[PDB]
Amino acid sequence: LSRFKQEYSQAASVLVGDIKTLLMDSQDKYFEATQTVYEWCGVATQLLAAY
Amino acid sequence: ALDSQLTNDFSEKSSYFQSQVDKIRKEAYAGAAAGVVAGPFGLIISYSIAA
Ligand code: EMC
């Protein structure tokens, strides 16, 4: 029953960790996405305004 | 992951410690106690040797 506590610690640990990686992965991809937009959405307004 | 586990795993050794030092008493006193065969002065010698 020590093994029990062990084996599962193992699993949860590595999974919970992967989950973080995944979460952090997303965040960056979100940043990119939004940022990319904010950049164009920005040059654009100036141009429409000019037009 | 590492931290998650090293934390869980550490409490598991702290449990193994006391559970183990116990094994040590139980082994040693079951040994001294075994001096009942030879004289009680034998216990003094035995138990001093042990405890
Ligand atoms: C100039 C529309 Hg994001």
Query: What is the DSSP secondary-structure string of A2-49?
Result: HHHHHHHHHHHHHHHHHHHHHHHHHHHHHHHHHHHHHHHHHHHHHHHH
**Ligand 1 neighbour A44 (Cβ under 6 A):** yes
Which residues, 6 or more positions from A17, have their beta carbon under 8 angstroms from its beta carbon? B1, B4
Contact residues, chain B to chain A, C-beta under 8 Å: 1-2, 4-5, 8-9, 12, 15-16
Resolution (angstroms) stands at: 3.3
Q: Whose CA is nearest to atom 3 of ligand 1?
A: A41
By what technique were these coordinates determined? X-ray
What does R_g of chain B's alpha carbons equal in angstroms? 18
> What is the helix (H) or strand (E) element at residue A1, kind and residue range?
none
